[PDB]
Design a protein around this ligand. Structure first.
Ligand code: HEM
Ligand SMILES: [Cl-]
Length: 214
């Protein structure tokens, strides 16, 4: 479509559906998810966000990203750090897994943020808006499947405290995206990257399923 936020949504509808149907993901939604499986996803999210957020902090000033820089409303590293301390304990940083699929997603994120930051938005959109959209559902699922204690910890990731209305925020984010100024050449690179980001998630899910079935 015309608006970037639309072109993105439409250009990734296919890969997005593949993501949904990925065995691991498909099972998660079907309510079937183990703690180890859940821990693997959380550990993955931590790594991905740590990388993504580092790159965002590096290019926040650039015009290629500034318009969609919403640190307070979206940052997840800290939330994830709280959750992993709960899921893996006080030395989670020294025990959480860091698999190849994860490693590869991180690598691309740093590649983008270092050499082609104009593509960073493709990842911020993919991750933030995706997690913001599916967050409420997935939470209740793992909340019902895992049956965690009353510790009052472990799921901070599913709550963006600095965002009152997900809907209104998404509207604002999309708008800032469409306001993002880029040449058509770049716009196409951003679209591709978004498909890449999905693929990366897909590879990731597939690898986790593989690890779990063993
Ligand atoms: C349990 C699996 C999943 C289901 C069933 C699912 C379902 C949905 C639905 C129904 C929406 C809301 C559409 C809207 O608000 O217009 C959405 C949006 C989104 N999802 Fe997923 N999703 C899942 C997994 C993923 C994954 C793995 C990614 C990629 C990491 C992803 C990224 C996104 C993005 C970027 C959006 C926003 C698209 C836009 O701008 O309109 N989703 N998803
Ligand atoms: Cl809402």
């Amino acid at each position: 479509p015309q608006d970037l936020s639309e072109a993105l949504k439409e250009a990734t509808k296919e890969v997005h559906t593949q993501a949904e149907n990925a065995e691991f993901m498909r099972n998660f939604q079907k309510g079937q998810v183990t703690r180890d499986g859940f821990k693997l996803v959380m550990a993955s999210l931590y790594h991905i966000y740590v990388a993504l957020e580092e790159e965002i902090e590096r290019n926040k000033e650039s015009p290629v990203f500034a318009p969609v820089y919403f640190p307070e409303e979206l940052h997840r590293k800290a939330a994830l750090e709280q959750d992993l301390a709960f899921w893996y304990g006080p030395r989670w940083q020294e025990v959480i897994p860091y698999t190849p699929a994860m490693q590869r997603y991180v690598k691309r994120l740093h590649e983008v943020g270092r050499t082609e930051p104009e593509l960073l938005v493709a990842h911020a959109y993919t991750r933030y808006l995706g997690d913001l959209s599916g967050g409420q559902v997935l939470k209740k699922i793992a909340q019902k499947a895992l049956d965690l204690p009353s510790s009052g910890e472990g799921l901070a990731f599913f709550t963006f405290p600095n965002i009152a209305s997900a809907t209104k925020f998404k509207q604002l984010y999309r708008s800032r995206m469409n306001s993002l100024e880029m040449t058509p050449a770049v716009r196409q690179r951003v679209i591709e990257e978004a498909k890449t980001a999905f693929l990366l998630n897909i590879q990731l899910f597939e690898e986790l399923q593989e690890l779990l079935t063993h």
